[PDB]
Symmetry: D2
Subunit: 288 residues, 4 copies
């Protein structure tokens, strides 16, 4: 069974120019817009997902991530984790239900790396636009823009990664799948964490600047859809970070590109299938 924290639920990013962000994400990446709220944010979800949002856009003075939340099994599991997080030593805040459109209340806290993380149990299930009975074999959203299948994860840059990991593995029920060993002596300079059987649901890399966003990732269906996302990136003059390639760490076949506002995002596919009884894989710092 999949219990406790189930999967990445949503990332709310900051954009410099709303209209430019709404067009980029809706028409280039191919996310499906589900709503806009009186606070100025626009709600987006991957076409094949079932919940109302997985990526929220918001205008502000700088690029970067406001926060990253995960959906948990149920409301009981929400209070339980709230209590454990507190018991651990973190100050928990409770954003009331509805503060976000179609979203129940969420338990928020801040990590030693300085990132804002959320936990919620309820969020509307608008579905994927396909019938629940004999779902058709083909659908048009599938090909609107890049059109990724799900918010896969995010990679964060922050200072106290060790304290970070203990929180996730000792309290949130994640496990280390991959890690990058320090140049020497000691710790991990990068950690890939999973709360399921995916290579990872979130990853953290050691860095001084607190709360920095490296990237939010979207899973694609094949290597060819990655080449395709590449072509669509050029057609739309999207600044690309690292063209299509393989990731030693994760084995992901990916493309790193930039938002019109500087936020790095990723469209990849590939990876093995780890489970909680697995020992993590490690990479020497010189190979990182």
């Amino acid at each position: 069974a999949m219990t406790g924290v189930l999967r990445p639920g949503h990332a709310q990013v900051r954009v410099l120019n709303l209209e430019e962000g709404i067009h980029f994400y809706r028409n280039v990446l191919g996310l499906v817009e589900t709503g806009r709220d009186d606070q100025g944010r626009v709600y987006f979800k991957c076409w094949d997902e079932r919940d109302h949002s997985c990526y929220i856009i918001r205008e502000a003075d700088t690029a970067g991530i406001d926060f990253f939340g995960f959906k948990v099994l149920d409301k009981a599991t929400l209070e339980k984790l709230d209590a454990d997080l507190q018991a651990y030593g973190l100050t928990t805040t409770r954003i009331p239900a509805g503060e976000m459109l179609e979203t129940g209340e969420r338990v928020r806290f801040e990590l030693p790396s300085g990132h804002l993380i959320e936990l919620y149990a309820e969020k509307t299930c608008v579905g994927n636009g396909i019938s629940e009975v004999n779902p058709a074999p083909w659908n048009a959203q599938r090909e609107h823009g890049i059109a990724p299948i799900q918010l896969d994860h995010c990679l964060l840059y922050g200072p106290n990664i060790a304290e970070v990991q203990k929180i996730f593995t000792e309290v949130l029920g994640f496990y280390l799948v991959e890690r990058v060993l320090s140049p020497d002596g000691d710790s991990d300079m990068g950690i890939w964490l999973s709360c399921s059987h995916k290579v990872h649901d979130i990853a953290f890399v050691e860095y001084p600047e607190k709360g920095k966003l490296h990237h939010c990732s979207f899973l694609l269906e094949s290597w060819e859809q990655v080449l395709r996302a590449g072509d669509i990136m050029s057609m739309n003059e999207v600044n690309v970070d690292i063209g299509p390639t393989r990731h030693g760490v994760t084995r992901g076949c990916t493309i790193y590109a930039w938002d019109p506002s500087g936020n790095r995002f990723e469209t990849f596919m590939g990876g093995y299938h780890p489970y909680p009884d697995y020992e993590p894989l490690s990479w020497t710092y010189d190979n990182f």
Copy 2:
């Protein structure tokens, strides 16, 4: 967090001839031979898996599946599941550790459909043939035969699927992802169950005969690998049931082929990502009647 029942752990299948059985599986299917015991069972595992075995072959007079087992999180989860299966009403058998090469003890029990299912917490980790430090994405093994990535599931034919469903969802922590609705006077004619975020770890289709194994399934990296297995099956004059195709009742692109003994197997890739909070999808009987899992055809 992945808890309780984790994943398909092994299937023990019956081959009419042990020798030709080892060649096909290791040379055509591409599974990795990992050991052979006193009873003369020969063990295999997909190259990318980490545990000693996922597929065990035993010589016999009849083809089919002896049993199908799931790996559970830990010893404590195992004793608990054993306990809950008792409390629900099923009788439990306890197989001693070592009875299977490199495996801890397992909890066995028969379903109302007749198939024997097993649960275990321990099985030796032998690795995936690749270094644990600075690992490459693959090695020569990925190109030995079809070389599937993992034992994905199995589909079984049995008489009391409504009860099997209850057992798997209420006791074992599985959830329904998809089903085939009754011809009209509704009920369920087929069920696809997941204990993870996979479309299904196991499936059952209503059927008179008890203990029927429709097929065991192995996951391939991509659609091209599926095309490649088809070329490999052709070359080895393997008897293919239904060539590469868009499955249907599961979104998988697959090939159903036969064992030299008559055991059907599946090489496929693709699927969506369901989670425990999702509601299942449904297929109307007529639609299903056109599918690959229909008792007829």
Copy 3:
């Protein structure tokens, strides 16, 4: 250099319902419509080709093919082929320019198999919808329906293959790439002919009835696109002959499907790269 007969240029097929055949080819197959003449024929071209047309549909009381034409290098070449065909003994018919929209004059003759074949040197180049300067690798057109890349060939059914092989090899400048051997008593049941370095530009199979059309063929980019074609066909209730599969006698990974009128067509990719100096491959009858 590619000389004489260059490539399949057009196929004219009969449909029982004009407007019902139009929606299908433009929306299911995804061909691009380029025009409609007074005879009530409508023209199509794969999106990546440059010529005004490659497939023409005419309303008639019976399905099948009217003719199949090949484009040749130039007028000189066309007049030469015209003479050469007659010197072999074949009666030649000359169709005037503009008889077909945007098409120059063609040379038409009938084979022993009962099919009509055409040669033409001129047809307006309308382009592939992409610019001539700094062209992108593709555009929206590539994802409208199946959207094949080119009219690849056709397979014809007819009675005098031996003589048909003769004409193509000795008059038209083609060569045998592959052949299916007759049961034991050796002659040729099937014939795959090339006038380029493609596995084949046309193919014939010995059959007692004359002028029969087995299928016109359309090329896709990848196995992934063949799989996609299968999905689009399923979504549109297209009657599929034989599902996605690896055809031995060509290596192509294809799908045979049916037009709403009964005209079979194929979408496939793959094969090898043969040349005029290569000896042909052979298949035994049973294997066939």
Copy 4:
């Protein structure tokens, strides 16, 4: 039909060390070793080609290309071609048959760009290691190393591209498919020439030094086989130049890597289907 110059026949390149070259091309690139003569050259051909060789390496003081030969339709075409070169103002050397293993006489000349070009009509057809009757659906050779399907072309660096262009399109019956403009006072900083219906069998870029080799290219089956070439390269610790990506000029999805001696080679796939009746595509200097 394919007449005149059919396709790229062979490339002889120099390797600082025979043994390491023999290992790389045989076991990493996956070329099939066909032979070795008394001058110290070892011979290779792609597994799927049919002729005895497409790539010949020699131990020398430097790394570059000695010569690159094109196969022609027949002997008459060879004499024909040689005579027109001379009538063009090019002296031609005549290498006697046998000189190169399993290879007949060959016409050789030099381009104004300093490179040596060969033309030949005969080379022993060894086959592709698969039967000529009921060819197997696949062989183990197909997965031995990267294992390209054919010597697709080569790109040369040298001066006076304009001169070379004209020899090719005016004497060898090649034609321009794509060009790269110069900033202004427009001439071609780069040209892509085809003598078939391939995007190109050869290309040249304006360079001060003459006789330079930029890279020899090998064709792959699909976008996934390239990613695979990527992985195999990494596994063998081969230095990769420009990671897997979409080209633009040719549309080819490729990866450039280096020889254990410095020669750049390529393994790609993809591209359209041009013919001699097509007008070349153009790229402004800014994109190049």
